[PDB]
Write a protein that binds this ligand. Structure first.
Ligand SMILES: CCCCCCCCCCCCCCCCCC(=O)OC[C@H](COP(=O)([O-])OCC(O)COP(=O)([O-])OC[C@@H](COC(=O)CCCCCCCCCCCCCCCCC)OC(=O)CCCCCCCCCCCCCCCCC)OC(=O)CCCCCCCCCCCCCCCCC
Ligand SMILES: CCCCCCCCCCCCCCCCCC(=O)OC[C@H](COP(=O)([O-])OCC(O)COP(=O)([O-])OC[C@@H](COC(=O)CCCCCCCCCCCCCCCCC)OC(=O)CCCCCCCCCCCCCCCCC)OC(=O)CCCCCCCCCCCCCCCCC
Ligand SMILES: CCCCCCCCCCCCCCCC(=O)OC[C@H](COP(=O)(O)OCCN)OC(=O)CCCCCCCCCCCCCCC
Ligand SMILES: CCCCCCCCCCCCCCCC(=O)OC[C@H](COP(=O)(O)OCCN)OC(=O)CCCCCCCCCCCCCCC
Ligand SMILES: CCCCCCCCCCCCCCCC(=O)OC[C@H](COP(=O)(O)OCCN)OC(=O)CCCCCCCCCCCCCCC
Ligand SMILES: CCCCCCCCCCCCCCCC(=O)OC[C@H](COP(=O)(O)OCCN)OC(=O)CCCCCCCCCCCCCCC
Ligand code: HEC
Ligand code: HEM
Ligand code: HEM
Ligand code: HEM
Ligand code: HEM
Lengths: 126, 57, 247, 385, 62, 93, 385
């Protein structure tokens, strides 16, 4: 329930700084490797919890081929952990392949919902 | 002959559960007898009938 | 707190009923009933144990009939309403020495002897605590204790000062099977008898536990097989993905 | 359509246990709910068959319990099964709650499920306390005395409500008969709340250990999870049979075989082992009103959990700091339980205060900070600018 | 409200009666420590107290 | 009865996931399979893999709390000994 | 949608009591069900608050009841409320069943509702018999002995099932403690069966006194039938407060104020008034095995009613012979109840035998013949040929 605009704001302030990007990005990459969702054949945007209207609009607005790829990666992850194994090492999601694909859709749906709730509580300056 | 075995024991469910109940009957009886004989034999000289036969001699 | 007021811990003796297939040694229960009746029955009671529970465990029927008839219980009154006594039967409970708590506290200098029919389940230590307590009276209380009068030293008792003196001395009870009745022999037998008095279900409980553990481990392994059989189709399921042509 | 769907009752049976779509990825930690239902059936049936022989006066409670233990047939089986089954019930309930806290089962669709679970937790704590008090041993009298006497710290009404709880002026025959009637009652309230637990579960289905959606592949509950439940059912029955037939008094306290005495205090008054962490939380506050407020807040802090979890990913499967601090919380609970069985002595009160602070800083300080740090790490580890 | 009483009690012995869940001293008061009781500390102890409000009876403690 | 609110799980046919295209699944009858296949390989190699992955998370807090408990227990045993009374009085009051 | 629909629990409450579409034509006989719900809640609450003071041994049962009467604050209110509320529960339940078999509610869409009703009726009879046996008066004890020694007529296992019921060899301390544990227990089974009664009702909805379909105009249950039920609730509470406060031992027998004595028979052993017709049915047969078979058949003959009703229109609203023979059946039941309270003297055994035969000939002979005759009269009165 942290909004992705907050995460993106803190993350962009980290990434555009010279000093703490070169400190904080290696510990993030080690965190990503130790997380081990890639060993199950999942990108990170398959991990975002989808039972909220923002993620439902983002998954509805996601294009058709990306949605089929996401559905296969989820079904393969369920089938993999059902057998208590991992995917073989040639089937792991590589680091250049782990892209944020759902993130622009989530960000525009979140900006639309925040603009909606700012306009619903608007006050004219009379 | 596994075919005749299947057709007389596992084909109909009625004879299947009848065999399960008959086996449970005889299993319960002889399993109780086997456990009680092993228990009384493992505790030899400690039981009351052993003590009673000792004090009756 | 201090190990004095904790009490020294009783060590682990090799009881003949320790172990999951073991049974009470019934000859030692019979001898322990003799030790209770000739020494322990002067102060402690056994009012949870009926006479009929002894038949077929430590004595025969005639022996428990005679040991019950040597006592007097209250009968229902006569046709004139006066109270009447009765020789004991198998249905009655083992009587205690004192008629109330006040006679006990009067006869034992204030202290009350606990009822011994649950005392090995009521003390942390089990039979080892009872054995170490009965045999653990030093000849002298160690150098520097302020022992109050009427109290004795036993380090297994929490605090040290117990209001029960040493009551087990050698050859104070003759056994009718000729066992040499030392202090440790009598303490072993009376502790086995007290453990039977606390848990008279012990042997059948362990026998039923053998049957139950065998049947349940059979069922557990067999259910592991039946689960793996029913789940084989889902464990060995393969997924292929050909990306659809765009339209 | 099939008769198992066309019927009024059989469609309920079908929709809950036969055709109910479960996520295929769920592991053996998802058998704890079926296990708790079996535990509840065990407790209710053995309790009825002992209440057919139990008398609830202050004079006859203890000796009626030994009348169950000594001269009714298989009565030791019933009493050891009821007592060790209550303890196994609480162990399996702690596993159910710690699974739900690990895998994020408290999160956004299932908060009503989490809250009905917390209500169930409170009611079975109350049931187990009353049933301990019905034995009327030495531990149960003085446990009843301490826990009931804690309500005297309420500043205007406390003496009147503790006299109303007691039915008199101390724990006596009215208190024991009240506690027996309530210990008989509250399990049916627990069964109704279990039906409501299942009703809140059924509208969204179970979660899965990935935390991602499970709407994609699902298998019915019949002949997959029926037998996967049966595995742990037989394993639980085996371990319970060990504790009932070979070590029946290990999880108990030996002071309950002394009959209850208002005149002798047993010099170390502890409750049963599963109430020991909350007893240590209560003891570690140097006050009485703040102590009872802190124990009740320690049970009610589990409701703050869906609002302090600040992460976009459901569960701790793919987070490393959340896994580390979860196991810090679990062994903090175990240390708190071990501290609650020790005396009020010198290192233990500071250990109890620090462990209480860790218990409350997990839900309120550690989880938000760690989860937002993990959010920012998940972002900047894989986006480049 | 129990009414246990006094004329059958000499001193040489304590009474500790229990009633209403109440274990409680009751004892005749000696001269010897009626003014050992008025010999006391006031706050070289934990006890800034008054034996008049504690025991309103001069000769009988409870 | 009336229809209730929108949920996140339907039933067989209308679960509520995305549309699925291009995923083909294959499975064999269990009556034609070997159950208990690979149990002696998974019992030693897969068990070690799962243990190696998930044991620092469990055993570093267990080590911390067990060392804390043993140290507090040793201090409590020292304080109520003959050698450590003269710290016990200045410790408690 | 509204929050009362978009919830889990409020959806059930809304669907059953708020937006439930009732036929607008239903008269005041359609309040007996909500009345039985109120009665059940009364019995459960007053019974719990008396079980907080009841002791169940044979030497303490009767005196614990008088301890409730004389020593517990407002305990005479609780005891008189429980006893007269049990009898009022049975009068209202007889009205519910008589409405059901007057208006044809047993018929073909609602046969499972009728059968769940018959199960509820059997369970309430058992609950009240056990609760009358718990007070252990003189009618209580000897009623227990004659009703349990009914079961010794089974020619193979009868002595062992009666020695299993008794817990010994006649009605004593195990029997009374058993009957208390069961008299608690069976009301919660009744609450579960009432939930199943409502579930079986809710699929097709209630009938109406016309017997035609009620699908055409319907009224939500809130704000119309809530207040139409409130009218009968206040009337029922008024009449119950009359019998509790001004006339409390009227429906009871005076011999339950004699303590139970196994050596003195009270010279006319009769149960409570509502079990008198089944007692007269049992007493009419000159054999014990056939007597209990005929009593259980007299209450299981309510199941042959949806198969012997041979007419095309539902209910007796528009039939004259069905109305006449219905009220013959009702006053036969009242005469049977009055025969069951009399001794076995010379006109009464013949009157009870003929009334039992009329009771059985209603379901098995009178309803088919009168249904067929009314069918062909309805045909040839209006078709021309
Ligand atoms: C000993 C460890 C040896 C195996 C090992 O290294 O596992 C590491 C493994 C690493 O975990 P993982 O496989 O990455 O996580 C998968 C989940 O544990 C979930 O995995 P799962 O639930 O499929 O695995 C079941 C697991 C855990 O199963 C359960 O939790 C069920 C517990 C049954 C309770 C029965 C009643 C309890 C009564 C009171 C006690 O039981 C086993 O570990 C069987 C494998 C041998 O840790 C465990 O298996 C936990 C075992 C706990 C016992
Ligand atoms: C007083 C005796 C009543 C005789 C005069 C009433 C008028 C009349 O002749 O009605 C015949 C009337 C036939 O009228 P219908 O319209 O052909 O019947 C349609 C329905 O049966 C009845 O449909 P409904 O919705 O009219 O049902 C209401 C009915 C029936 O209401 C109930 O069934 C409620 C039953 C009791 C509920 C509370 C239960 C308390 C639990 C303990 C019960 C212990 C007994 O209560 C009333 O009849 C109220 C009107 C009374 C007018 C009084 C005129 C007196 C002369 C001036 O039969 C009755 O009204 C029986 C009720 C009499 C009960 C009062 C005693
Ligand atoms: C004795 C009962 C009758 C014999 C059984 C029979 O004859 O069963 C035949 C019926 C009919 O089954 P159907 O739906 O295929 O037919 C429908 C068209 N008539 O099955 C059933 O009752 C359903 C069984 C339900 C299984 C779930 C039970 C779970 C309980 C917990
Ligand atoms: C405590 C629970 C005890 C349950 C005891 C069983 C009572 C059944 C009475 C029906 C008798 C009858 O006469 O039923 C008649 C109906 C006819 O059904 P029909 O009209 O659909 O078919 C008409 C023919 N085509 O047969 C049944 O439905 C069989 C019901 C199966 C038994 C139910 C078992 C499961 C109960 C689970 C209930 C869950 C809810 C719990 C509370 C939330
Ligand atoms: C008090 C204040 C509460 C919050 C403010 C508020 O009352 O909120 C008003 C809410 C809002 O409802 P809405 O439809 O406007 O939702 C619009 C959302 N957009 O209404 C409700 O809660 C529903 C009330 C239903 C009442 C049902 C009563 C049930 C009676 C039986 C209870 C169970 C008995 C079981 C035995
Ligand atoms: C076992 C299964 C049984 C199934 C059937 C059960 C049905 C319940 C029957 C029992 C009657 C309950 C009455 C509730 C009335 C209500 O809560 O009314 C709520 C009404 C709604 O008013 P409105 O919205 O019309 O307002 C129109 C403009 N706003 O507020 C009122 O007017 C309050 C009037 C005072 C009501 C006092 C009732 C006291 C009841 C005592 C007895 C309780 C038992
Ligand atoms: C005479 C008086 C006796 C005799 C012959 C025995 N006992 Fe003992 N006992 C007695 C008193 C007054 C007390 C109370 C002491 C106290 O302050 O607690 C006891 C105590 C016990 C205990 C309890 C120990 C404990 O509380 O941990 C046990 C156990 C016990 N006694 C057993 C026992 C046995 C087995 C004897 C065998 C011959 C025996 N006692 C003798 C008084 C007396
Ligand atoms: C919610 C489930 C239940 C729990 C957790 C529970 C817990 C307990 C516990 C811990 C005890 C003490 C056992 C001991 O220490 O010796 C106990 C005793 C008892 N319980 Fe329960 N109980 C439950 C359900 C029931 C029910 C439903 C009944 C009655 C029908 C019941 C009847 C009893 C009785 C009679 C005792 C008496 C003492 C004894 O025999 O142990 N219990 N209960
Ligand atoms: C009487 C005790 C209980 C019973 C019978 C019970 C029953 C169940 C059952 C059968 C399930 C579904 C199977 C599963 O997911 O494990 C479940 C799920 C759940 N229960 Fe419980 N439960 C009980 C107590 C609790 C408690 C005390 C909590 C927590 C406070 C709780 C929280 C949950 C949660 C969160 C889930 C969903 C887990 C998930 O699927 O992600 N339950 N319960
Ligand atoms: C289904 C609803 C119930 C019915 C029909 C019912 C019926 C009865 C009846 C007829 C009596 C005898 C009254 C007398 O003559 O003195 C009775 C007594 C009793 N019932 Fe119930 N009862 C019900 C529910 C309950 C419940 C749930 C409890 C327990 C919580 C309970 C506790 C008692 C007790 C303690 C007595 C003792 C004797 C007395 O105080 O009158 N009842 N019951
Ligand atoms: C604890 C006892 C009972 C309760 C709480 C109960 C509850 C209800 C309720 C609330 C209704 C709907 C309102 C009404 O139609 O009057 C109803 C309807 C009905 N009940 Fe009962 N009932 C009980 C006992 C019985 C019995 C003993 C029978 C008959 C064997 C029975 C048969 C019916 C029938 C046939 C209906 C439908 C009547 C109709 O609407 O046409 N019930 N019940």
């Amino acid at each position: 329930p942290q909004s992705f605009t907050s995460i993106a704001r803190i993350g962009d302030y980290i990434l555009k700084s010279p000093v703490l990007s070169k400190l904080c990005v290696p510990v993030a990459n080690q965190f990503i490797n130790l997380a081990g969702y890639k060993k199950l054949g999942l990108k990170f945007d398959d991990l975002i919890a989808e039972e909220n209207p923002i993620m439902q609009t983002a998954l509805r607005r996601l294009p058709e081929d990306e949605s089929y790829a996401r559905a296969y990666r989820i079904i393969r992850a369920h089938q993999t952990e059902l057998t208590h194994h991992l995917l073989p090492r040639n089937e792991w999601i590589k680091a250049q392949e782990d892209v944020p694909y759902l993130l622009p859709y989530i960000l525009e749906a979140e900006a639309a919902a925040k603009e909606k709730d700012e306009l619903d509580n608007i006050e004219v300056s009379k | 002959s596994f075919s005749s075995l299947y057709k007389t024991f596992f084909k109909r469910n009625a004879v299947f559960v009848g065999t399960i109940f008959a086996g449970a009957f005889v299993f319960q009886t002889v399993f109780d007898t086997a456990i009680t004989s092993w228990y009384e034999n493992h505790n030899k000289g400690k039981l009351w009938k052993d003590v009673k036969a000792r004090i009756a001699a | 707190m201090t190990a004095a007021e904790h009490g020294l811990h009783a060590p682990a003796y090799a009881w003949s009923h320790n172990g999951p297939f073991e049974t009470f040694d019934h000859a030692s229960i019979r001898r322990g009933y003799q030790v209770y009746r000739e020494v322990c029955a002067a102060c402690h009671s056994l009012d949870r144990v009926a006479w009929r529970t002894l038949v077929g465990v430590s004595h025969t029927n005639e022996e428990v009939r005679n040991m019950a008839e040597e006592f007097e219980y209250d009968d229902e009154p006569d046709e004139q309403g006066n109270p009447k006594k009765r020789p004991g039967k198998l249905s009655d409970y083992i009587p205690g020495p004192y008629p109330n708590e006040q006679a006990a506290r009067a006869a034992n200098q204030g202290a009350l002897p606990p009822d011994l029919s649950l005392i090995v389940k009521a003390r942390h230590g089990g039979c080892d605590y009872i054995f170490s307590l009965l045999t653990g009276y030093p000849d002298e209380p160690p150098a520097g204790v302020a022992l109050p009068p009427g109290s004795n030293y036993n380090p297994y008792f929490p605090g040290g000062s117990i209001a029960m003196a040493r009551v087990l001395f050698d050859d104070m009870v003759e056994y009718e099977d000729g066992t040499p009745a030392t202090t440790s022999q009598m303490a072993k037998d009376v502790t086995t008898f007290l453990n039977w008095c606390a848990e008279p279900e012990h042997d059948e409980r362990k026998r039923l536990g053998l049957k139950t553990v065998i049947i349940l481990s059979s069922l557990y392994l067999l259910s592991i097989w039946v689960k793996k059989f029913k789940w084989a189709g889902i464990k060995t399921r393969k997924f292929v993905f050909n990306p659809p042509k765009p339209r | 359509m099939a008769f198992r769907k066309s019927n009024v009752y059989l469609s309920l049976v079908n929709s809950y246990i036969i055709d109910s779509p479960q996520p295929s990825s769920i592991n053996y930690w998802w058998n704890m709910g079926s296990l708790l239902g079996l535990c509840l059936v065990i407790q209710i049936v053995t309790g009825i068959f002992m209440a057919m022989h139990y008398s609830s006066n202050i004079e006859l409670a203890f000796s009626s319990v030994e009348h169950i233990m000594r001269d009714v047939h298989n009565g030791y089986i019933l009493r050891y099964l009821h007592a060790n089954g209550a303890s196994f019930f609480f162990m399996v309930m702690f596993m159910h709650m710690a699974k739900g806290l690990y895998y994020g089962s408290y999160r956004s669709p299932r908060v009503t499920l989490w809250n009905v679970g917390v209500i169930i937790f409170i009611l079975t704590i109350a049931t187990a306390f009353l049933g301990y008090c019905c034995v009327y041993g030495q531990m149960s009298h003085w446990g009843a005395t301490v826990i009931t006497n804690l309500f005297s710290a309420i500043p205007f009404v406390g003496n009147d409500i503790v006299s109303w709880l007691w039915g008199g002026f101390s724990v006596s025959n009215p208190t024991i008969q009240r506690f027996f009637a309530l210990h008989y009652l509250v399990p049916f309230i627990i069964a109704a709340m279990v039906i409501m637990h299942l009703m809140a579960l059924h509208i969204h289905g179970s979660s899965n250990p990935l935390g991602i959606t499970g709407n994609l592949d699902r298998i019915p509950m019949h002949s997959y999870f029926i037998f996967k439940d049966l595995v742990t059912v037989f394993l639980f029955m085996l371990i319970l049979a060990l504790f009932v037939f070979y070590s029946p008094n290990t999880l108990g306290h030996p002071d309950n075989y002394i009959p209850g005495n208002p005149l002798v205090t047993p010099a170390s008054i502890v409750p049963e082992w599963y109430l020991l962490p909350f007893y240590a939380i209560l003891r570690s506050i140097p006050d009485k009103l703040l102590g009872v407020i802190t124990m009740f807040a320690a049970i009610l802090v589990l409701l703050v959990l869906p609002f302090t979890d600040r992460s976009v990913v459901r569960g701790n499967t793919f987070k490393v700091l959340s896994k580390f601090f979860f196991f810090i919380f679990v062994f903090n609970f175990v240390l708190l339980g071990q501290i609650g069985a020790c005396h009020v002595e010198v290192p233990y009160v500071l250990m109890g205060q620090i462990a209480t602070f860790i218990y409350f800083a997990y839900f309120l300080i550690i989880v938000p900070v760690i989860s937002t740090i993990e959010n920012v790490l998940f972002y900047i580890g894989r986006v480049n600018k | 409200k129990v009414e246990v009483n006094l004329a059958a009690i000499p001193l040489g012995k304590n009474v500790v009666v229990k009633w209403q869940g109440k274990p409680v001293f009751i004892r005749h008061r000696t001269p010897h420590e009626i003014q050992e009781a008025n010999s006391v500390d006031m706050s070289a102890l934990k006890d800034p107290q008054t034996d008049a409000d504690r025991v309103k009876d001069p000769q009988w403690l409870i | 009865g009336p229809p209730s609110g929108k949920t996140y799980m339907g039933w067989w046919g209308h679960m509520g996931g995305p549309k699925q295209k291009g995923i083909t699944s294959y499975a064999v009858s269990p009556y034609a399979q070997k159950p208990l296949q690979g149990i002696f390989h998974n019992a030693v190699f897969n068990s070690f893999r799962r243990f190696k992955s998930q044991f620092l998370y469990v055993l570093i807090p267990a080590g911390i709390y067990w060392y804390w408990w043993k140290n507090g227990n040793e201090y409590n045993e020292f304080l109520y000994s003959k050698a450590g009374r003269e710290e016990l009085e200045r410790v408690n009051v």
